[PDB]
Amino acid sequence: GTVNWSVEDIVKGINSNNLESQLQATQAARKLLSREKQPPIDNIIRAGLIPKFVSFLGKTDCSPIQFESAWALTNIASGTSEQTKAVVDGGAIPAFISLLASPHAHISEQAVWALGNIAGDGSAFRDLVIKHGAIDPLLALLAVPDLSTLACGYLRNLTWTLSNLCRNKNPAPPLDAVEQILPTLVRLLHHNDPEVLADSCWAISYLTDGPNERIEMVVKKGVVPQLVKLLGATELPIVTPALRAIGNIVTGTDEQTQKVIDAGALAVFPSLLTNPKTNIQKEATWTMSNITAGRQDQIQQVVNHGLVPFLVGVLSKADFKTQKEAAWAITNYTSGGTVEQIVYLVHCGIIEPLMNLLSAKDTKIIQVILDAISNIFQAAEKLGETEKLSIMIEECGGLDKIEALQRHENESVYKASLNLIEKYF
Amino acid sequence: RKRKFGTSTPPKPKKNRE
Description:
By secondary structure, chain A is mostly helical. Chain A contains 28 helices and no strands. Chain A has one domain (1-425): Alpha Horseshoe (Leucine-rich Repeat Variant), CATH 1.25.10.10. Chain B is largely without helices or strands. The interface between A and B is medium-sized, with 47 and 16 residues.
């Protein structure tokens, strides 16, 4: 009936003065725009149909055409930034916000979806959706005693749209909007649906990626223990955003990092640092690097949890990016650690993998490793053991690497390698 | 010395309803 229409037939039907013909044509457009391959979005836009769909959004007495037009506009706004912009330029934002209060759950769901696409375009349309007043009705849709009474798809769509309202960072979302959304986000973060949990964790990760004041807004809500719990989850779609959020949080002040530590996060890193998923290993090692850049008692907590051998393992064998994160962790550890902590690090076997990594073609990691070596040598000096560390570095073949670095492109590598060779060798 | 950042993939920014 409304399958495989031509855009010309759709235009004829919508340009008729017959609401039912308009509805059939709008459904035909929806079915065209919801097909598997190559939906004719640009042809629909060229025909000037967006303003008609937007007007149909306000037909309270014809809920079917409201739903059909909402779906069509949702699929148009899901495309390029120019197609989303075409939807916005037709006045769709306030119409969808008004539809958020529809008595029909499927229509309000479609409005939530469309606003999610518009906000997901980027920070400008996100902030414009916020300025039109979307947050209040969106959150009102979730103001129920128990989230389990809502349909799973409805709740997942609401969570995804809210996460898009927390997304992007040039500029970051308005502070007032973040504060208005956060409690509902915590609620959702305690839900039992894995997709809701994943998207809520992703929203928290968005909100924690930035200045330490944003991290503080998030941490003050008491979400860190739940984030650690989810970090322990069996589903990787949940562990990934939880780990991102935890890493973001430990990029902040020593007190925020301490909040992460007090919640028991380190006990999970034996698994994360050996996780078969490369991205998990990389981001866990990055998190560890930011924790080793903390205070000496926090480095000591890293030591007590037995995580130094796991850093040695990652440095010894892993994807090169994870090995770079591990080099960063080692340099931070040696820069901020006590003499006893650096001695412990050496006793765990860091020297050999550190040296084997000096044969890489990435200048940054070479600089990081040479700085770590300098710090360890300073500790040795304080202990009067410089010659023994020298012998160790020679035995594993690191002396030859440092000598080769003496003739390197970068000036810092040149200088540091020559300083090491002339002061300790 | 703290270094800020820069299915298991992040949620899609936009979603078509098939």
